[PDB]
Amino acid sequence: MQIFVKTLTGKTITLEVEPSDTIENVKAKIQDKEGIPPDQQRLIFAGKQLEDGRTLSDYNIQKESTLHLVLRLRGG
Amino acid sequence: MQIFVKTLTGKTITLEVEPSDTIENVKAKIQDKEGIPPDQQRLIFAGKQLEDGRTLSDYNIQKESTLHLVLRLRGG
Amino acid sequence: PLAEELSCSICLEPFKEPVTTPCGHNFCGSCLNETWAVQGSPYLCPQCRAVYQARPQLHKNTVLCNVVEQFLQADL
Amino acid sequence: GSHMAELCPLAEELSCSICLEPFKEPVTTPCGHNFCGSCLNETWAVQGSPYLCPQCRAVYQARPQLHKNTVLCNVVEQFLQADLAR
Amino acid sequence: GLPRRIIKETQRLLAEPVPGIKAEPDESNARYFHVVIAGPQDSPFEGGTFKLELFLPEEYPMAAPKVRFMTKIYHPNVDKLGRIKLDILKDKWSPALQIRTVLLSIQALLSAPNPDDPLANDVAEQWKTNEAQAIETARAWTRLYAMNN
Amino acid sequence: GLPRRIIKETQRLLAEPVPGIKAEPDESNARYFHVVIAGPQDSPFEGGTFKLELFLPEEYPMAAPKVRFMTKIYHPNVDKLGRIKLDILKDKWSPALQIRTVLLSIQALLSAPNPDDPLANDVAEQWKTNEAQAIETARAWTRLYAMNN
Numbered sequence: 001m002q003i004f005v006k007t008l009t010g011k012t013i014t015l016e017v018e019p020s021d022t023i024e025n026v027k028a029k030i031q032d033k034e035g036i037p038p039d040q041q042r043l044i045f046a047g048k049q050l051e052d053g054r055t056l057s058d059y060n061i062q063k064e065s066t067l068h069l070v071l072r073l074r075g076g
Numbered sequence: 077m078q079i080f081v082k083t084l085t086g087k088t089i090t091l092e093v094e095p096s097d098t099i100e101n102v103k104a105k106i107q108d109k110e111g112i113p114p115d116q117q118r119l120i121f122a123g124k125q126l127e128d129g130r131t132l133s134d135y136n137i138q139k140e141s142t143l144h145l146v147l148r149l150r151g152g
Numbered sequence: 153p154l155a156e157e158l159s160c161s162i163c164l165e166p167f168k169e170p171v172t173t174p175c176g177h178n179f180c181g182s183c184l185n186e187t188w189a190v191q192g193s194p195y196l197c198p199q200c201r202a203v204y205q206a207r208p209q210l211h212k213n214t215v216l217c218n219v220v221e222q223f224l225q226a227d228l
Numbered sequence: 229g230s231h232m233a234e235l236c237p238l239a240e241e242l243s244c245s246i247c248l249e250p251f252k253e254p255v256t257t258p259c260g261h262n263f264c265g266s267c268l269n270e271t272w273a274v275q276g277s278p279y280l281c282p283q284c285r286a287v288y289q290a291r292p293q294l295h296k297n298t299v300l301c302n303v304v305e306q307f308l309q310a311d312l313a314r
Numbered sequence: 315g316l317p318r319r320i321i322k323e324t325q326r327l328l329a330e331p332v333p334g335i336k337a338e339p340d341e342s343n344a345r346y347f348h349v350v351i352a353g354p355q356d357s358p359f360e361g362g363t364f365k366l367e368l369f370l371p372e373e374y375p376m377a378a379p380k381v382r383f384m385t386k387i388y389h390p391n392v393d394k395l396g397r398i399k400l401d402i403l404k405d406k407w408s409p410a411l412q413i414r415t416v417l418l419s420i421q422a423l424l425s426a427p428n429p430d431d432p433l434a435n436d437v438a439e440q441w442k443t444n445e446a447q448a449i450e451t452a453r454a455w456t457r458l459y460a461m462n463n
Numbered sequence: 464g465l466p467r468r469i470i471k472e473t474q475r476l477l478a479e480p481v482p483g484i485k486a487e488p489d490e491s492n493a494r495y496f497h498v499v500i501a502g503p504q505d506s507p508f509e510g511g512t513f514k515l516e517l518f519l520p521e522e523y524p525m526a527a528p529k530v531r532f533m534t535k536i537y538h539p540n541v542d543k544l545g546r547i548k549l550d551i552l553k554d555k556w557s558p559a560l561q562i563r564t565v566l567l568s569i570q571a572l573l574s575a576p577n578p579d580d581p582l583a584n585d586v587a588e589q590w591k592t593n594e595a596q597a598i599e600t601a602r603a604w605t606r607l608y609a610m611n612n
C-alpha cells in the first residue's frame with residue numbers, strides 16, 4: 001500500500017509502506033526524501049502526534065491516508 | 077550579438093555580448109552562469125589566452141564564435 | 153511535481169538565486185540572508201534545525217539556478 | 229534510456245562534472261557546486277587539507293561535512309524516473 | 315498590499331483544508347485568522363471544538379504568528395487567558411513553518427501535555443500529582459466550553 | 464572495461480574536435496592518445512605542428528593525464544625530453560578538467576611562457592636576459608622540428 005506525507009511547504013510526497021511498518025521506518029523514508037533527520041520529524045494524523053515505536057496499523061493508518069509533517073515541538 | 081562558451085564539462089552556454097565588451101565582462105557573465113570567479117577563469121580562442129583588458133573586437137571574435145573555458149594555469 | 157521542489161520554503165515562490173546549506177537544503181539567497189540576519193548565533197536551518205555556531209558563507213547553486221531558469225523560460 | 233521530453237534539456241545541468249553521469253546522491257559545496265557524494269568523496273579522499281572545489285578551486289582548510297541536496301536528488305530522480313502512462 | 319507568502323498560504327489554506335482544523339481570515343483583516351481546532355482523538359479534549367485567534371505580525375514569516383486560545387481549556391501549557399507556551403511560537407520558530415503546521419502543532423500539544431515545564435502551575439501540578447483527575451477535569455471543561463459555538 | 468567517462472570523452476573528442484588540436488586514441492590503446500597541437504597565432508611557435516603524447520593513468524580523473532611533447536620545442540617550461548612543467552598536470556589538477564581542457568591549457572602555455580620559474584633553466588635564463596633571441600630561437604626550432612613533421 002501507499003500513503004501520503006504532507007511536508008512543511010505543503011508539498012505532498014507519496015510513500016511505499018506496509019501496514020507493519022513503524023513510524024521510525026516512515027521517518028527514515030522521509031529523511032531519504034527530505035533530508036530532515038527523524039529526531040526533528042513529527043508526524044501528525046487525526047491530531048495525534050504519532051509515536052516512533054507504534055506501527056502504521058496500530059494507528060489505523062490505511063492506504064492513501066495523509067500524515068502531516070511537523071517540526072519537533074515542546075510545550076512549556 | 078551572441079557568443080558561445082564551452083564550459084569545463086563540455087556543455088556550451090550562450091552569452092549576450094557586445095563587440096566592445098572586455099574579457100572581464102564576459103568572465104562576469106560566465107561567473108553569473110557557472111559560479112567560477114574571474115580570477116579562476118581562463119578563456120581560450122584560436123589557441124590564445126585572452127587578456128582581461130582587451131575586448132572581443134580586438135580579437136576579431138564575432139557572432140556565434142566559441143570560447144573555451146579553462147582553469148587558471150601556471151607554467152613552471 | 154517539481155514545480156514544488158523548485159519553490160523556496162520561506163517565500164513559497166520559485167527559488168531566486170538559490171543557495172544550498174551544508175545540510176543540503178536550498179533557499180533563495182535573500183530569504184536565507186533575511187532569516188539569519190534577523191538573529192545572532194546559533195544559526196539554524198529552517199528546514200531541519202541543523203545548528204551552525206556561526207553563519208556559513210554560501211554562493212548560489214548555479215545548477216539549480218539554471219534549472220529553475222530553464223523551467224521558467226520554458227513556461228514563457 | 230528514454231526521458232520525458234520537456235525534461236530532456238536538463239541532461240547537461242544534471243550531470244556530474246567528475247563522472248559525467250546524472251548526479252547520484254549529489255552534494256552541494258558552499259561555493260555552490262554539485263557533485264555525486266561518492267565522486268566528491270573520492271576526490272577529497274585522494275588528497276589531504278586543503279580541499280579544493282573541482283569547479284572553482286574554492287579552498288576549504290578542512291573537509292566540509294555535507295549532506296545530500298534533496299531538491300537536486302528529487303529533480304534528477306524525476307529526470308530519470310518520469311515516464312508516460314502505460 | 316499583502317506580502318505574497320501570506321496571499322499564497324491563505325489561498326492554499328482555503329483550497330487544501332486540513333481535517334480537524336478550520337482557519338479563515340477576517341474579512342476586515344487579512345492577518346487575523348479565526349481558527350477552530352478539534353481536540354485530538356483519544357485525548358481528554360476529544361469531541362471538543364476549540365476556537366483560537368491566530369495573528370500574523372508584520373515580521374511574519376521571520377517571526378511566529380501570535381496564537382491564542384479563545385475557548386477556555388484545561389491544559390498545563392495553556393493559561394487562564396488562553397496563552398500558549400510552545401517553543402515553536404518563540405525561540406524555536408522557523409520561517410519554513412506555516413499557519414497549517416502551527417495549528418497542527420498546537421493540536422499535537424493538546425494530544426501531548428507537558429506538566430514538567432508549567433505555564434499554568436496549578437493545572438500542571440494537578441496533572442503531575444493527580445493525572446487522572448486532571449484528565450477528567452480536561453474532559454469536563456471540554457464538554458462545558460468546547461461543544462458549542 | 465573502460466570507465467564510462469573516458470569512453471564519453473573520447474566520443475566527444477571525435478565528434479567535437481577543437482580547432483588547432485587533434486587527439487585520437489591508439490587502436491591498440493584507448494588510454495594512449497596521439498596529439499597534435501598547432502602553435503598559437505602570434506606566438507614564436509606559429510605555423511608549428513607539435514606532436515604530443517597524452518596518457519590516462521588508471522586513477523584518472525582523480526589524477527591528471529600524463530602529457531609529454533614528442534616534438535622538440537624551445538620553451539622555458541619544457542625540457543629536452545618534452546616533459547611539461549605545468550601546475551594543472553600536478554598540484555593544481557582538478558577532476559573536472561578533461562583531455563580537451565588540458566590540451567587547450569598546454570596550447571595556452573605555448574602562447575604564454577613563464578621563465579621566472581624554470582623547468583629548463585638554460586632556456587628560461589635566455590628567455591629572461593635576451594627575450595628577442597629566445598623568441599627567434601623558438602621560431603627557428605619551430606621551423607626545424609615542427610614543420611613537415
Ligand SMILES: [Zn+2]
Nearest residue numbers: 160163180183
Ligand atoms: Zn525564497
Ligand SMILES: [Zn+2]
Nearest residue numbers: 175177197200
Ligand atoms: Zn537543513
Ligand SMILES: [Zn+2]
Nearest residue numbers: 244247264267
Ligand atoms: Zn559523479
Ligand SMILES: [Zn+2]
Nearest residue numbers: 259261281284
Ligand atoms: Zn566551487
